[PDB]
């Protein structure tokens, strides 16, 4: 019935190619039922010290994809679930990722607030967390 590590396995079979991310994103977008489940799993995975920066950045791309495409699907369930964990994950990666990677996530999170992907309540928390880490 339920495939074990169905989400985890896909995260380890992705590439930095849009054709790859889209293949997993479109697969997740059809199963919005597990929105809160994949959201916490994503969060937990990126919080694991066993996950190298390569995998962290890869998983981050999948999040941007599903939350952005969710606008067309009109499924706020994804944005809601991923939004509450995004503020945490973004705050963590922004304090561990190098200069070259922080810049990449900057444009990723920028488009999220520019396109009003998440609620203003959490959006204001994400942007402030990024600035807080810059307070030394």
């Amino acid at each position: 019935a339920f495939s074990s590590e169905q989400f985890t396995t896909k995260l380890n079979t992705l590439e930095d190619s849009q054709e790859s991310i889209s293949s997993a994103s479109k697969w997740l977008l059809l199963q919005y039922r597990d929105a809160p489940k994949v959201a916490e799993m994503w969060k937990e995975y990126m919080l694991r010290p066993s996950v190298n920066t390569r995998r962290k950045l890869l998983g981050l791309y999948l999040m941007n994809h599903v939350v952005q495409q969710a606008k067309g699907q009109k499924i706020i369930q994804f944005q809601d679930s991923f939004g509450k964990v995004a503020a945490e994950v973004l705050g963590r990666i922004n304090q561990e990722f190098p200069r070259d990677l922080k810049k990449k996530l900057s444009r990723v999170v920028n488009i999220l607030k520019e396109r009003n992907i998440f609620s203003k309540q959490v959006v204001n928390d994400i942007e402030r967390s990024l600035a807080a880490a810059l307070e030394h």
Partner: peptide, 9 residues
């Protein structure tokens, strides 16, 4: 191939 937010698919 490089992934950018403006080019997801």
């Amino acid at each position: 191939p490089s992934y950018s937010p403006t080019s997801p698919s």
